[PDB]
Each structure stands twice: as structure tokens, then as C-alpha cells.
Design a protein around this ligand. Sequence first.
Ligand SMILES: CC[N+](CC)(CC)Cc1ccccc1
Ligand SMILES: [Mg+2]
Ligand SMILES: [Mg+2]
Ligand SMILES: [Mg+2]
Length: 332
Amino acid sequence: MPQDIDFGLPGISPGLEATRRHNLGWVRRLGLVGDGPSLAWYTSWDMPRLAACGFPHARGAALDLCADAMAFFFVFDDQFDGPLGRDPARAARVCRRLTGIVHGAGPGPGADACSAAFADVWARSTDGAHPGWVARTAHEWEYYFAAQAHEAINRLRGTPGDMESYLQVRRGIAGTDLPLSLGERAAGITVPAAAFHSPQLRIMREAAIDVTLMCNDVYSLEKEEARGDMDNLVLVIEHARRCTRDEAVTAARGEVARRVIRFEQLAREVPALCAQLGLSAVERAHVDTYLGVMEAWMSGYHAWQTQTRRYTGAPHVLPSTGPGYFDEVLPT
Ligand SMILES: CC[N+](CC)(CC)Cc1ccccc1
Ligand SMILES: [Mg+2]
Ligand SMILES: [Mg+2]
Ligand SMILES: [Mg+2]
């Protein structure tokens, strides 16, 4: 059981309570969350604590954006736990609508709640951001939206992919590097490109994102398996290795542990790398904060998922015999 699994990872943002108030008003104003069942269900996820634990460097309005972005991810995600997630062409068309917002085509007044919420998050994200950050993060959003239809293809196939194909789909649908781009933005830093593209930081970024989605795969397996989801590390290992469920969970834990070890080995090289690049003291401080942002995403996501009611509650309040939401908020 998830309660008997810990992964071996290493504060919390002071704005948690203020962000809880803002975010509750925001999801209602945008129409992303309604009244009654959806609202109590949304509240039980505790999106503010995810923001405050996953992005502890964020303060004030920056933490508000983190929580609102998380709200969009989770509400949008669940819209595919139903007929949409078994209809790849329809999923691709819906996600093309969202992608158009990324690249400039504003949704306009009266658009659906998911389009309006995304447009608000994206506008707030890019306001005052460095153009290199905007370009990279725009392509990250594109991958996230485009990957959803491939998860639907895999559901229809009914077998897990091999490891390489699992990673290609799962890294996309998990939000790719978007949590780290968000944490960088919310911390108010800009990583110098020379450091960002070092082999060390590129490997570390990929490792941190893998760690969180794999930790999620383990804890979210119960609600996903009954829905015919196929892009879950435990199912991929079990199918590839012809092993028991316990053997597959053990191997999944090992995939997380080796990535944490790699991350921490490379982190020790970062001061020396900054010196070899001749970065300024301010730049080195921003790189140090970027390291903390990655570390806190890994440790803080796990801290959140052990206390949330999303994964223990989903099989009971939204059983697999019906859709995985109370209200359709995404027109298809
Ligand atoms: C990033 C939020 N997400 C993915 C889009 C919403 C369902 C859950 C998640 C969190 C952390 C790792 C992997 C997935
Ligand atoms: Mg998903
Ligand atoms: Mg999901
Ligand atoms: Mg999951």
C-alpha cells in the first residue's frame, strides 16, 4: 500500500493560508470548480498545500499563481477520465484548442472554463518573464497538451508500452518540465543559459521530473488501474518483466532511488561548474536557488501526496464504473 512506501528524498511557503483563500475564489470565479460535490472534492485535494510544499520559495502573488496552475492541471487532467480519454481524435482536437492559447490565439470572452483558466495562468506566467523562459515554457505546454491523445491511444490498445514509449507519453502528460519552469518563475530567478544547458543541470532537471511522476505513479495506481490507464511505471515494469505486483513496485522504487542518487551526485558539481563558466555571484546565487527549486519539487510533491485525499478518496467517491469527475467543464 502507498502508506507503506516512502522514497528516500530530503520548508513550506509562508503564504499557504493567503493562497488558499485566493485560489478558492479563483477556481469559482473562472468556473473551473462549481458548487457541492466538485467543490468538496476539489478542496480535499488541498491544492494550496501542494503549492506551498512544492514551491516553498514562492511568496505572495507568486504562490497564488502556483496554486492556480496546479488547479488547472488537476481539473483538466480529470476531464479525460471518461469518454474523452477513449477518443484520441476528440482528445487531440480539444488539446489543439488549448495549444492555440499558448501560441497567441486568446480564447475571448465566454470561452470554456478550462480555456479561460489556462489563458489566465499563461498570461500571468509570461508577464515580465525573460523571453528565453517564455519560448521554452511555450513548447513545454505544447508537449503537455499534445501528449494527452497518445495516452488515449494506449488505453484503447490495452497494453503498457515499453519503457522508452512509456517515458515519451508519461513525461508529456505529467506536465513535462512545467513544474520546474513554474518554480523558477515563482522564485523570481532566471537560470543563466550556460548553466541551464550544462550536462549536469540537464540531467538533474530530467531526473527531478521523473522522480515526481514516478512517485505519483506508485501512489495513484489504485485509481488509475481500474480505469484502464496504461502509462503507469508499475504497470510498465510488470508487463515488461513478467513479475508480481510487489516485484514491480519494488523495481519502481529502485527507479526513483537511482534518479535521486544521480541528482544528488550531480548537484555536488554545480558550484565548480559555475566557477568554470565564470558566472557572476548573483548568477551563482540564482543557480543555487534553482537547485533548491528542483529539490523542493521532489520532496514537496511527495510530502503533499501523503496527506492529500485525492488518491485514497478517488476510488470511493468516483468509482471506475462512472466518469472520474462530477461536472464536465471541458467541451469536446
Ligand atoms: C503536475 C500535476 N499533475 C500532472 C499534469 C496533474 C494531474 C499531477 C502530477 C504531479 C506530479 C507528478 C506527476 C503528475
Ligand atoms: Mg493524467
Ligand atoms: Mg490523472
Ligand atoms: Mg497518476
